[model samples]
Target chain A: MHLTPEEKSAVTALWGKVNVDEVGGEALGRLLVVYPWTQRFFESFGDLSTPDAVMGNPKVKAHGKKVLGAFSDGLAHLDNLKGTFATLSELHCDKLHVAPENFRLLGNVLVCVLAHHFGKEFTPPVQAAYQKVVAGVANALAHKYH
Target chain B: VLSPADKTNVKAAWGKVGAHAGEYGAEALERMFLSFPTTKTYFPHFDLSHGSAQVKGHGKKVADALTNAVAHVDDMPNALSALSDLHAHKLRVDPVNFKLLSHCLLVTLAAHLPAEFTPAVHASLDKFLASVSTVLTSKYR
Candidate 1:
């Protein structure tokens, strides 16, 4: 779960200028559509029976922000992760076990969204560093499962 | 599945922690709760102060479950099938909590069973708890 300073810097550098609102929706909304299984936890997020419906939903839109906010939180507290993401851990596990595969998939997909937006800046080196960040983020988020 | 050596290490480690299972288990739960207050959301009804009886009671159950996991390590998923259903469907406990507890238990063991908790033993016990967690959350969709 340890990240080199450069790795943190690489992720942090881009995260600052990135489109937080839109990208969050793009990643999370895209996730629910591409992976319907994820919708199980979002049964309360109103009608998302179809991809179009999911994209248009308010709940999904806002949760998308909160979800990204969680990653931002991870960035802030990489060292003390277990306690930092504890609420998400508690709330996340309250319903779903939040399989590590799902968490990792979400992170990778978020990277894809970043790649989509920052095609030029997300060079191989930075992309490599970000993936490390992604893995640590997934590990921290998925800490409850072991 | 554990290899012969891993199983041996796990068995030996547990043997050392046997009589103090409940005690260590309580310490782990206490660590988890104190370190991760959000976890206490699951136990709003329980008196969450340090050294509460409820936490200790649940700790005993957790210890018993570990023993059960060890007893049927060969057929863990099946042996823990009922527990899996309870955790996944009934309790709806998130999988993350398993790892959190696993980490907490690791800390508990290291401090309480220092000499017996070698690096090799720690690795084995960690894997054993991980396997148990996998079984517990197997029913999740």
Candidate 2:
């Protein structure tokens, strides 16, 4: 909703060039739906002894370091394959509450993210499809709010 | 029981912790999201049996960046670089997504975390989030 005119213009331009794959489109849509419901889970703090806290606590520095190391190995890198669908659930309540116009904000963001991650090789049709999906999300949101 | 020197030491230690608020913030979030029922919703479809692994994996990524961040808390350039690098090469969570996540996480913290969720915390978080936002908005490099 905070999008400046320039931001809107950029999104409109990107939409003209976007191509949306069904898989990716569905993934993004799912992400939108689930983002809100998952918000409640993140609403509170968690227990201590979190691997990061343990590592940094200075009280249990050794265990923390071990935990952190294990974490690093497990997560350092991997196959690029991942589900964009997770975004909706991961985003939860915030996505649902996001203002109608601000969906443009989300669209602009998805474009930038997809472009950034997928690289320049991504074609115009792909960009257009993404834009279409984003437009659908916005319209969906509009309907939800109205 | 607490002496002046001990007070000073504790204050210094807490100051160090305070300095790494952004780091702490992100880590706390990663952990908070990994707890019981919440982690279950990570996927579009519900599947608690394996969701924990996924949550743990995500937590580690955020934790890695957070630990590196804490290590360099006092070293502004290093801290900023670490944060930037995570955005650039490592986790590659979208800048907007990261910013948005940070906002949501803080709001969650504000509502549920601790006494720190007071007005002072809100103001501090706002300022820090703004600073981090500015950094993420910069060129990928």
Candidate 3:
């Protein structure tokens, strides 16, 4: 899980401009649409049918920002991924009773959104780095379930 | 009691830490937990043992709150009153813990912003945190 200097730089640069709230909102919107089962975990969004409905819901939107903000808040501490994902694990496993596969599924969805959102900026190196980063985070979050 | 100039320095220097908020915040939390093991009792769910996920996550929360509070320094009482109430009444946190946390927070700031964290900067931040501590613990009185 060692990111090369170039990969590190690529991640730092890309995330520098990332408006986490906007990305979080959009990504969650997509996630609900693609994996409706996840909607069950979000009391705010569970009943919503359309992605637009989910996005329009203030609670869902806020939760989306909170989830992604926490991720963004700990991006620099990738080496401490175990600690980074501890709370997330507790919430998912102990509270929500979510399957670990959901985390992996969400990571895949987020990568797709990032690739499309960044457009030309999401180059091969960028994709590779981001994929690694998401995988690392997902693995850490899902560690307890395994 | 920070002078006008000291407040300016505090704001300007705080901006630097905000740039790398997550990293610096986690470091501060780790330092706090390491230096003050007693604080671990408040967080029974997470492993507060150095570098635990819960510690890092909680650290990011505190750091974010501090960074956000900088903008509202003028209305310190209003900015922190809710938090003060939460800690004092609901959480029943001891006021002394706030003082301890401020000490660790200052050390963390100094470590991260070595050049900018001058004596005056330290003084101002201490004064600011002390004010926050007072407001936070007001309910205890």
Candidate 4:
């Protein structure tokens, strides 16, 4: 979960080029590329045969198209920085469609971001604040998804 | 030791920050740059300078619009509704990545706010964060 100086440099440089909106967009693109369900979602949209037959249903297709637009808009909001990051964090916690089995890594990723950006500025209280939101998302998803 | 009047005043002040957020948005980024060297490492590709104008330009189209959505007419619930729509239609970023981005972001805030981060503000932020995340979760699933 530690970021090398080089990695930090990469993130900061990326931030400079894109600012917030574009950065969010780029990250979204990255996540979409890597997500387990994305290819499946695309395949389902294309009527591919699979164990999850509903993945390719017309109803789901309609939903996916709608969701794609929403994702773009959401990236803009998260980049705004007007609202708290906790708000954005909670939003993703609730909406991600993956199974609850692989959710906690999300928290680890966030901790890494904190380390990368803030260096050692994260105090104990701040650490507690970070944990609650991450855990809140995970717990909520476990309950909601299962 | 904030009085009820003080709380109201503070909320109003924060609301004002939301309105002119395109401006403050840049300042926040600059402040973040100083605190988080790693966070700013990616600036060269875009040739992003620390110039206020450049930050402001980037902030308005991106952060200001977002702040406006979250700052809807003093009604937090409506703001969350706006956030949900954006997440659902415009910025379909994974909740996981958003969460990760947010963790670093808040630490950036905490580092910069040694003079002013009260428990009340922290708690309010906590609730606001959870509310926004709920919108994302509900929108996706």
Which stretches of model 3 miss by more than 4 angstroms?
B1-141
- Show model 1 residue runs off by greater than 4 Å: A1-22, A30-43, A46-58, A65-109, A116-146, B35-46, B86-97, B114-120, B137-141
Interface DockQ of candidate 3: 0.01
Which model is ahead, 2 or 4, in terms of lDDT?
Answer: 4
Number of colliding residue pairs in each model:
8, 24, 1, 37
lDDT of 3 by residue, B4-40 (tens): 8867977988877866766677776677667765455
Best by TM-score: 1
Most lDDT-accurate candidate = 1
lDDT of 3 at B38: 49
Estimate every model's Cα lDDT from 0 to 1. 0.80, 0.42, 0.75, 0.45
Of candidates 2 and 1, the better by DockQ:
1
lDDT of 1 by residue, B40-114 (tens): 656656787888899899989889888887887788888888888777655655566788989999999899887
Q: What's model 2's TM-score?
A: 0.35
State the DockQ of every prediction: 0.04, 0.02, 0.01, 0.01
Instruction: Please give, for residues A1-146, the per-residue lDDT of candidate 4 as tens digits.
Output: 13345443443343343333332333323333334333332443453334344333554435534433443343333323224334434443344334333345445444444555556665454555545444544544344221
User: For model 2, how does the per-residue alpha-carbon lDDT over B1-141 read when each residue is reduced to its tens digit?
Assistant: 333443343334335454444444544555444542222222334223433454445545554554453344444344676567555543333344555556665655555546545565465555554555556545343
Worst lDDT run of 10 residues, candidate 3 chain A, spans: A37-46
Q: Write the per-residue lDDT of candidate 2 for residues A1-146, one digit (tens) a residue.
A: 33345544554554344333322332333333323221122223232223343223332333323422322232222111022222432343234333334446445555655676557644675566556555554444344221
TM-scores of the candidates in the order shown: 0.59, 0.35, 0.49, 0.38
Q: Tell me the TM-score of model 4.
A: 0.38
Q: What is the C-alpha RMSD of each candidate to the true structure, in Å?
A: 7.4, 17.8, 20.3, 17.7
Report how far off residue B76 is in candidate 4 (Å).
3.9
lDDT of 1 by residue, A23-83 (tens): 8988999888766656656778889878899988988889888888878867777677777
